Predict the structure of Proline iminopeptidase-related protein.
Amino acid sequence: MREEIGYVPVGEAELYVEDVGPVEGPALFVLHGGPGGNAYVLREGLQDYLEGFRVVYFDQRGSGRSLELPQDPRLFTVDALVEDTLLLAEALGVERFGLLAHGFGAVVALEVLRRFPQAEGAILLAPWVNFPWLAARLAEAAGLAPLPDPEENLKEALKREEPKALFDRLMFPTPRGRMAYEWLAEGAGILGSDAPGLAFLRNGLWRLDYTPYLTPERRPLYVLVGERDGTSYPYAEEVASRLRAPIRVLPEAGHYLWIDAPEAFEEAFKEALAALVPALRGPL
């Protein structure tokens, strides 16, 4: 199998890239979440279903295995993440491509679609689009009545419990899914910079509600989410209905929905991939 791993210069940043599969095959770019995450776990979960695609897994600017950026919070914006995706595609000589996104990756994917007709479609896994809503859920998970101010909800939640404890509850319906995730993640031995997350926080990420920018998308778009992903569901219903995208909600699955429900995920993901070519297979 073809696999080309390296650092690809994109102008403001150098990205860790894993360019996998037939070079002339149909291309998909993978947008991980966070912000400040990486594509390691995501690749391990998706790659078995993606043979015969050219899949470009990458870590976003300054994040995960990518090259550390200068101390400058202005480098960390949605626009920069979007533009990086296109610059990466051009560096690799890919003209048209689909998108696979997870969590916060969804906002980046939707902005790539909106701005760039080169993007041919997307599968949004566990999309995050409404951060005030997520902050309300964290505060709720900590036993608090949500306040109107989302950054105050976050601050008050984090006074009661550590972020990892709260996110773990939202993300992982079973201890066994969580432990499988942690063993896999820690096994990668990736030391991700704190800088991307801190900069997005400072730039007002928790005030970002992308909801109003969601409108019906002509291109093929699918939403897959875990019923028990407290970071995405049930808000993902709003995402799907505004985009007029099919949604599949997997029972008993959290944020890493392919870990919690491998069989149900395989079925839903294969359906989503097939739907990316409606000229051949037809619509939904």
